[PDB]
Design an enzyme around this catalytic site. Sequence first.
Site, PDB file in Angstrom:
ATOM      1  N   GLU A  72     -77.164  37.499 -17.933  1.00  0.00           N
ATOM      2  CA  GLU A  72     -76.341  38.691 -17.753  1.00  0.00           C
ATOM      3  C   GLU A  72     -77.000  39.623 -16.735  1.00  0.00           C
ATOM      4  O   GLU A  72     -78.148  40.032 -16.918  1.00  0.00           O
ATOM      5  CB  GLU A  72     -76.184  39.409 -19.101  1.00  0.00           C
ATOM      6  CG  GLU A  72     -75.451  40.743 -19.057  1.00  0.00           C
ATOM      7  CD  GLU A  72     -75.428  41.445 -20.405  1.00  0.00           C
ATOM      8  OE1 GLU A  72     -74.391  42.055 -20.738  1.00  0.00           O
ATOM      9  OE2 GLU A  72     -76.440  41.394 -21.135  1.00  0.00           O
ATOM     10  N   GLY A 121     -84.064  44.360 -22.866  1.00  0.00           N
ATOM     11  CA  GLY A 121     -83.548  43.762 -21.634  1.00  0.00           C
ATOM     12  C   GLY A 121     -82.177  43.124 -21.763  1.00  0.00           C
ATOM     13  O   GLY A 121     -81.599  43.074 -22.851  1.00  0.00           O
ATOM     14  N   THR A 122     -81.663  42.623 -20.639  1.00  0.00           N
ATOM     15  CA  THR A 122     -80.345  41.987 -20.596  1.00  0.00           C
ATOM     16  C   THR A 122     -80.385  40.615 -21.263  1.00  0.00           C
ATOM     17  O   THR A 122     -81.455  40.043 -21.462  1.00  0.00           O
ATOM     18  CB  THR A 122     -79.821  41.822 -19.149  1.00  0.00           C
ATOM     19  OG1 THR A 122     -80.675  40.937 -18.414  1.00  0.00           O
ATOM     20  CG2 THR A 122     -79.745  43.170 -18.435  1.00  0.00           C
ATOM     21  N   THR A 123     -79.212  40.092 -21.604  1.00  0.00           N
ATOM     22  CA  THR A 123     -79.115  38.815 -22.307  1.00  0.00           C
ATOM     23  C   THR A 123     -79.324  37.645 -21.343  1.00  0.00           C
ATOM     24  O   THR A 123     -78.856  37.673 -20.205  1.00  0.00           O
ATOM     25  CB  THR A 123     -77.750  38.663 -23.012  1.00  0.00           C
ATOM     26  OG1 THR A 123     -77.456  39.854 -23.756  1.00  0.00           O
ATOM     27  CG2 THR A 123     -77.756  37.467 -23.962  1.00  0.00           C
ATOM     28  N   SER A 176     -85.784  37.646 -19.990  1.00  0.00           N
ATOM     29  CA  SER A 176     -85.261  38.957 -20.356  1.00  0.00           C
ATOM     30  C   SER A 176     -86.417  39.900 -20.647  1.00  0.00           C
ATOM     31  O   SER A 176     -87.396  39.505 -21.279  1.00  0.00           O
ATOM     32  CB  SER A 176     -84.370  38.843 -21.592  1.00  0.00           C
ATOM     33  OG  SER A 176     -83.240  38.029 -21.329  1.00  0.00           O
TER      34      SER A 176
END
Lengths: 244, 231, 241, 250, 111, 235, 243, 240, 195
Positions: free
Chosen positions: G46, G29-31, G74
């Site tokens: 993010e 996943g995204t940060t 995330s």
Amino acid sequence: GSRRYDSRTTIFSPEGRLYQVEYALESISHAGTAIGIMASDGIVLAAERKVTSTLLEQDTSTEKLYKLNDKIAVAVAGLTADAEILINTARIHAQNYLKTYNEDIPVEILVRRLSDIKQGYTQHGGLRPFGVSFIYAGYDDRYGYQLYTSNPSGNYTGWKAISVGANTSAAQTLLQMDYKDDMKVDDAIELALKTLSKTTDSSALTYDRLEFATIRKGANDGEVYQKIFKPQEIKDILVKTGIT
Amino acid sequence: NNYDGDTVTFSPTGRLFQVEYALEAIKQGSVTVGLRSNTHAVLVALKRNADELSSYQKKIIKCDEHMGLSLAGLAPDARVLSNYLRQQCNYSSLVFNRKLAVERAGHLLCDKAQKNTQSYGGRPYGVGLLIIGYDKSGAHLLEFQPSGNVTELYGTAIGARSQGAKTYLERTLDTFIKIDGNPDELIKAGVEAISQSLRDESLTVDNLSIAIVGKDTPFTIYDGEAVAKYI
Amino acid sequence: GYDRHITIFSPEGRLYQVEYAFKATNQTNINSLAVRGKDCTVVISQKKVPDKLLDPTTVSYIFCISRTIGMVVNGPIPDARNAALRAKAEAAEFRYKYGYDMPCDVLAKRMANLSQIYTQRAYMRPLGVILTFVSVDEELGPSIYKTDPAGYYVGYKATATGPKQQEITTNLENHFKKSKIDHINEESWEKVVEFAITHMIDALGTEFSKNDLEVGVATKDKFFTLSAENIEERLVAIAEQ
Amino acid sequence: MTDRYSFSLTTFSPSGKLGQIDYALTAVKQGVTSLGIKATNGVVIATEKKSSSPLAMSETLSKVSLLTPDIGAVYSGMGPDYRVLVDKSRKVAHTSYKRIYGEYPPTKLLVSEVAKIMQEATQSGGVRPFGVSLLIAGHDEFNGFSLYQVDPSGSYFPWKATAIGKGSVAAKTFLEKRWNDELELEDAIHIALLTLKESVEGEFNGDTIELAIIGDENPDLLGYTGIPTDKGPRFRKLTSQEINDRLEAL
Amino acid sequence: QFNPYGDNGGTILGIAGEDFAVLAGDTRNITDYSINSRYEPKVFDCGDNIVMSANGFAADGDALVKRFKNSVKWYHFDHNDKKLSINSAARNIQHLLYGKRFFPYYVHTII
Amino acid sequence: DRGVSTFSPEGRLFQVEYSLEAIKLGSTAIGIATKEGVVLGVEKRATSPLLESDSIEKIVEIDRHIGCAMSGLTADARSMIEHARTAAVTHNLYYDEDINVESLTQSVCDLALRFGELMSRPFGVALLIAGHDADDGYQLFHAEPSGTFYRYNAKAIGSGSEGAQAELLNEWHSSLTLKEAELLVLKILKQVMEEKLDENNAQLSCITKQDGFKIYDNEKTAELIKELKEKEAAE
Amino acid sequence: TGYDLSNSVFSPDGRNFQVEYAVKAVENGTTSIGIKCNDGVVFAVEKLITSKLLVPQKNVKIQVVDRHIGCVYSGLIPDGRHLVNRGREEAASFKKLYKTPIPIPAFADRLGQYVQAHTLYNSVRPFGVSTIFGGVDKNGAHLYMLEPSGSYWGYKGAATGKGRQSAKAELEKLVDHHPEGLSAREAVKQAAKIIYLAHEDNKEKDFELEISWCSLSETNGLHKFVKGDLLQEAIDFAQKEIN
Amino acid sequence: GYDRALSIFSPDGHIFQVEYALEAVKRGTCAVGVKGKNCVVLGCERRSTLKLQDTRITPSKVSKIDSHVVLSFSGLNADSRILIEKARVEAQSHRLTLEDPVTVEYLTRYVAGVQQRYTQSGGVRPFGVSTLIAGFDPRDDEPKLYQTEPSGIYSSWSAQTIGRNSKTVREFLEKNYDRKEPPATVEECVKLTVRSLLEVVQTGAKNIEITVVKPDSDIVALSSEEINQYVTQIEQEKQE
Amino acid sequence: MDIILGIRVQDSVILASSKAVTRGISVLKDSDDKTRQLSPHTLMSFAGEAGDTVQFAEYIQANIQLYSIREDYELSPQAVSSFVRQELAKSIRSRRPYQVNVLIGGYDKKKNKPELYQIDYLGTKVELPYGAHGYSGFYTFSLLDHHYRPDMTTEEGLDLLKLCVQELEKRMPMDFKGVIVKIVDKDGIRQVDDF
Ligand SMILES: [Cl-]
């Protein structure tokens, strides 16, 4: 999920057999032999205890022959613990009938009820079947003296003489040879013991390796008496018939 | 492979294959396009038929006077989810005398689809939805995926060959957003967008399906000779 | 080989899931120790904060179950907290129903029975933890009772749990062979804590700072954990003799 | 969630064997030796206190348990399974009998209830059998003294004397030679200590052996006076000192 | 004891013409000898060219009208925007009312 | 083994796709819609000559204005028909009117996907639901076990479906009469059937606005079969 | 083998492979990050701009629980939403019975026990999210991070997602260079920077910055989103640092 | 509760559990049904492997559902009792509510519906039983004979057989039974039923059971001697 | 309903039951048969609250007929009466009890004896030579105490029954519109069409 571990106890084989019922019958075939013989004036129940010990308390022991009510008894072949579950259910069923109709339960009705319970475990619930075969010995005023058997499939049938458990093939052949319709209880007692004495896997048939019972009209006037034989009484009948 | 038997099983790389297989059912479905301006929001759907004797499967469903969606994938699953939206829109009206926000409607769909992806026995929904609506914060367009992911967009497309229409909208972004107070021109842009996803077949009178909602425009569906104007 | 996935018997008469739960116990790589004084019961445990981003105050494997009972866990923290929350609920319910504070050994038995159920029922997994309960019981006095994933439990004169438990166990065994008594003959709990830390240092062969240890102390009518400064004072006294 | 294991985990194999029961019996075989001997005026049950650690207080762990004032129990196999069975056995003695008839159940019927519980774990959904064999000694007015064995299947048998667990085969042979129908309680205790010494490796004393009897009524252990018909429990657990006294005359 | 019913007064009147129909009702709302409102609408447009009023206990009246309006909405959803005929509406309202046979809507309804 | 509500890698429900294979093994059923009415016809397919063919009920009344033909595991259809009849009558009770054919079909299709681990498997039967209402006129629907239903001008289901559907492709036009439709069903049934078509092994039915849903007598169908033979021999 | 096919099964190691596979979804996943400051906490995330068709500032990822707790995560976004919904029910019942708003440590365990419960049975799947959360209570500021196993600890700084290593390194510098502490307004600026620096791991697609904060002085201990000038100020500071 | 889907579709579109239930019927003893002009006869096989039986008390193969309807079967004996009991209950329930005994078609439709329900219910297996249901509707002289099977499909038959070696006896009936002129009398119908069983049975002693059902609740079971007379007459005519 | 009588003689049981059905101020019917045949040799008459009477009688009838089919055997009157009693004893502690009183007249084919059982709505069973429910017994028991002899014939029983009905017609306020009389013996159940 949980599906992974399910044995699926209630399914058909490609041949159309119920796996678990067939395997339960295989279990029962290793159990101690039980014989039932029906006569004109009574019924005999004989059964062999499995490889006993000298330190087993026999007089207070009961693994084969059980009393359902005053008129009906059963001989067990299979798992004793499983049998006791069904026996207690059958005892209750008989009492429910007596409370409802104020009459003792007819033998067949009791047998059908227990057989229907066994059937249910083969068709639904996902549980293993009861690994038990019964010989029912009973009396009522409709059909008189009756012998039945039931097995894990929940199928039951009536008999003049029958065996369950181990060596039934050999036992049934011997019974089929010496049985006659005009036979009496005393003669049936002798036939039962002689059949066990030949089919037994033990070296010799003795009093401590047996459970025995009779259902006689041999009671004071028109009524029925159940006699569960004591160790000393089994020893006496073994000498009388000329086995020991 | 060994980790796609049910929805309750992660793969070694952290993937949910049953959810991904449900996502695949959407790509097999017929194309549908969604786009909006500041005043109006439009759904354009290419209906699919079984054969020449058959009717064309309906793609657009009304949820409320101010909200509705288009479907792509398993139609019965769209019926279940649209029914849920109808109830939620209706609960908001009866209890709070309040038209349900399009953003909140997306949140409810997300959470409903999620429960099916984490529990044993059930299955993910096999359908994607494009929800349009006009609420107190203007026109809206949402994209629903049965993984649970819901996304608010200016325009989008889902189904087979949907990448062509999505690229067109990505170029036209600055133009069609400015089409305010002009429903026919916004539909034209939607019909021209879905045309980029066509191969062999073209837009006929009983093939095309259009829906619109706006400032002083209730959610209405156009089919048959009503869309002949836009062909 | 599905007899190794759920809690049913293998042909050897073994429960592999229970055995593997025992192995999860050492996943944290922490060693704990418990000893009894005259008027107190002391429990110490290694504290390891590898990440600098962690708030070290929240990193703990010792729990205050009731006012009288304390519990240290050997195993992963999620299962540890699962056990802690349940023990707290059980201890509170006991007091409400029966009108007196739940004894340490009775709580241990209760949690052990719960663990036993997980070894018999298929849908519930065992918790990968070993629970060491400590108190000063009003009837039995200083008490140490320890539970494991098999559902086994027993009282202890002293005990140790973790990867290097055997080294600590033998060290304690040898001390009680000399003194020939079932406890640490000492008046103050401060000196009993000093004994516990000293014998852990000797057994493990490592020196400890104030932030490397975690201490819990049970006295009559209360159980409490020591702060970093309380432990520092304890470490100073050990070094000065 | 929900317990979705509503199906049997013990099933018949093609040979007619119930695997999980057989495997449960194997677990009992690995367990520490325990035995029971019946005398004319009493019954004795005994076992080794196999301490898991010398730091562990073996007094806190009770392998021999009172079920009713006149009935006691001991086991071989998995200790935790035994502990929950004793809890259930004590409760069922009240719920299914004492709260109905106003008196404690006779040995055979309490055994029957325990047997039932163990049978259900062999057939019910989502459970394994109990991994223990029990030896239950007891007394009641109409049946006198009695000793019963209960296996994982739920099957139970009455014994004059027997042994279960690690060295049961050798122990049963030892008991066959020594047992007779004219034994007094003290003679049975003597034989019990002789039989149990064979299966024990290490220390053999009152602190490493657990032994209890079903014998005469103990009015001193009743806790109250004033009711002639209440004469006290027949179950008594022998102390560490009482065992050591009989080890000198061994 | 709690009495779940009340009387909000008012009166309504429906007359059927040859190619038209009217449904009238006063705008007064009361309890006992007090006026609650001099203008509280009682006759409602329910869509599909149907007008409705449920006079008596206003809380039950509002509940019923609200539920019928709801029934009209779901009739469109479930049956392809079909117009609910006046006879069909009447039968639907019977089931709404009889549904609370043992705890009735205390109103006299006219459509 | 594997879940009942499992998706395949292609994005289809295994059990639904497998039930469609069971329907392909079923006896042929054909429906044709016209402006004068909708005709429904079926292949009876008796397994033995001793079987009394008139007891084979593969065409069924749902209401006076809605009829139904089936194909596949016909035993599964009984609960679907019961639900349809109840839905039709219940709607008349609540709304004092006939229920729309589409609405009736939708109600039947709502049962389709109510299977899991509710019933244990999908239905193994497809239905041709034909009827008439005031709004959309004469209609024919095809209801699958997937929960999907398509409207059709003409449709064939069962073992000879793809062969029959191709024939319906060419023959159907918007100006067909009822008599022409009756003969057309018989023509196509005779083409795809194994055994020779007669009044005993094939059944006709129709739904008109005036007379409602009617299953045809064996005497009436026999004449239409005789009328068919002559017109084919005419050229 | 086969120990990784079913949830709640111990491998011969003593591991639950299904939980470890859920971590892989989190790592994909995204940060997202969390920073503990003097009198509060700051959260940042993010948001990958997949297309120009995404409406800016509309697809909000950070969620509020009660009025004083912020949650960001995330991994699988729907799993995070499910967890927050539960968190909101937990916080509501606490306030219903005990009157006071739920303390952060108390709230942390409520989520912890719920996530841990999803590792006890094979009939459920573990959560595919690591959740960073916290806020201000009577005892002050608290920051937490919760993993798929149900494991959680308190943090001075926290980070998860694809750019967690890059973020963790930056957070460790702030802890060393600011022992006396960091202010709320500083933490917002630093949060923006760390997300931008962590974006190098997702450098293919451009992104959108989203920040929120709870502070006793700046927000009266309530959770609020960073908007307008203060957001642009933090973006400018972040853009200046990368160049 | 146990909710496991045991009856499910396979790739080739078959429900194997239902098909394996038919194999259990194939194993069962043979049963035959023949309807005449004013009667119906149900013939049943009794395998002679089981001697030393008590024929008084042994469950008979033909069961009365009501005074005017009978049910025979082939397949699992234990399963058949459950269907018979449910049928008997429904028969009395119908009399109670409709104030009229069940038609043979209705009773068949009910039994068939129960069998079908067990093919798509969770946690249950299908009945390993096919039935022959015969009788006369109330105030009606037209004979009725229906068949059911595990799948749940049912249909009416001029004559039909089920069970082991049913393929052979069905072959016999297909050539010997004429629709235009069925067995006019009771004798002719019973004779044809016994003849059809003699193709399969082995010995004509105690292996054949016959039950004759006539209009207006007139049901009777033939004895050993009565059946033996038919067996004697058939073979004596055959010797030519 | 109103009046139901029963008398057990040498070789049969005779039940008499009124024909009137009165709801309010009107006699709606004057030919109502207040009885149901439970089995070929067992008959049950009934009286009590409207609706309950028939509902209960038919429910019992269905259960006995079910037993007869299942076992291919007729239950004894004693067995049927015990079943009926239990149903009423169960009923009296229900949410809404069956408000029905019954007489069960049967001929036991095993013992070759007629049997009459009186059971009220509480489930109070008694075997009697003659019985009645409601206000009927207040007039009829005194007559039967005088005249009844146990060795009576069926014809003598009917004459004694006529003497009971005549007294009821003379002294009771309600016009019960005569009685339907039914005899239960070894040959079964039959109705006396002229009375
Ligand atoms: Cl407990």
